[PDB]
């Protein structure tokens, strides 16, 4: 068959971060030669694997968790990094196995009016477990001041939207940031290389 990276990477709208897509992939040839070697990816990594070796390797779980983040914050998405992202809206484990990819979007994902579809979680009352999607917008109460379903003084509407101009510096130009992940050994492999 075929693995639909072409509909993972090349898809139109990327979800904002606080709701991060999770697209399983299975029962297909997953050919990493056409990704890594496109060389348009202004960053990259791989962690429990080294990207060239993959072509020969057989996974099971393959989860492309796409999302848009702010240029300086890719640093925060990795194992071992804490900060507003990895702590609040999107976690990564530390022992996590698989690559991390980004290439600036700033042609598309930004409008001069700073497209605000892209938005994330600022105030959450804890710091995520590994891979916990948090979709709840229920208003935040900083002190003892009852919010009662409205914005309040020392209350917080927990979400926040990045202003993106297209003209931002490299820091605040939005990066599309995919991630991946996988099982490696001991389970029957729907995924393959060539």
């Amino acid at each position, epitope marked *: 068959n075929l693995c639909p990276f072409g509909e993972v990477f090349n898809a139109t709208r990327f979800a904002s971060v606080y709701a991060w897509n999770r697209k399983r992939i299975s029962n297909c040839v997953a050919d990493y030669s056409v990704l890594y070697n496109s060389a348009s990816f*202004s960053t990259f990594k791989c962690y429990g694997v080294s990207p060239t070796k993959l072509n020969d390797l057989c996974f099971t779980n393959v989860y492309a968790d796409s999302f848009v983040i702010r240029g300086d914050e890719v640093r925060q998405i990795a194992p071992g990094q804490t900060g507003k992202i990895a702590d609040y809206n999107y976690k990564l484990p530390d022992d996590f196995t698989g690559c991390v990819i980004a290439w*600036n979007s*700033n*042609n598309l994902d930004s409008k*001069v*009016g*700073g497209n*605000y579809n892209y938005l994330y979680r600022l105030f959450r009352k804890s710091n995520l477990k590994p891979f916990e999607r948090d979709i709840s917008t229920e208003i935040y109460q900083a002190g003892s001041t009852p919010c009662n379903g409205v914005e309040g003084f020392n209350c917080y509407f927990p979400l926040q939207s990045y*202003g*993106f*101009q*297209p*003209t*931002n*510096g*490299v*820091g*605040y*130009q939005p990066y599309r940031v995919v991630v991946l992940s996988f099982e490696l050994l001991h389970a029957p492999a729907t995924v393959c290389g060539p």
Partner: antibody
Amino acid sequence: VKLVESGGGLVKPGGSLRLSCAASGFTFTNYGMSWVRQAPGKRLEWVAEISSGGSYTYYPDTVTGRFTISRDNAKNTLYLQMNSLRAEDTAVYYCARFRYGGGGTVDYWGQGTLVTVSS
Amino acid sequence: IVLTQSPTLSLSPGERATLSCRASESVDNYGISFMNWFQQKPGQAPRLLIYAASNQGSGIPSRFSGSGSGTDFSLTISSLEPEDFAVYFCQQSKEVPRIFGQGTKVEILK
């Protein structure tokens, strides 16, 4: 904080000319750049915008004299053609540096340079 | 898309300056904050003042102040200095080419 320009120039109307701005004192990859003109007796016309890493390059419409802009980053440098040189195009151009995103911004400045479109 | 400023105002030291930045079309934007302020002195290329009227600044005397709402951003100064007057410019942003103010110069007698 630190910028350089070309000096003034004289071209017959109808032709083209390439214009320069030389930058220093920061990382010239990480700040989008923009040209701006001042027409004497007229409020500042904002000339054009460029991205930071690779070209966004959007202009005002008006009519474009098809001024084309590009950065040469390893040279920390900015470039402006203006084709279709015409009388009103006489003005003081400026190369200005944005900042990391905000309600803006436009912070620092090239001091500005005259334009002579004349016979 | 069309900003405008007051035709003229002339002032004196100690006075609190407010110039009318007249914005056609929308009021600010859904971004909740926009525009800007700038000052062109003779022989001195212009300079940032307060971005989105709401914020800054370094090198910016706190005597500089203001805010904005609707179609008119509110300029504020306190106890001017007779050498510190220059035309103030308010940008648009977020919509259309950004342009600038038609211009107005604080001017002092005596």
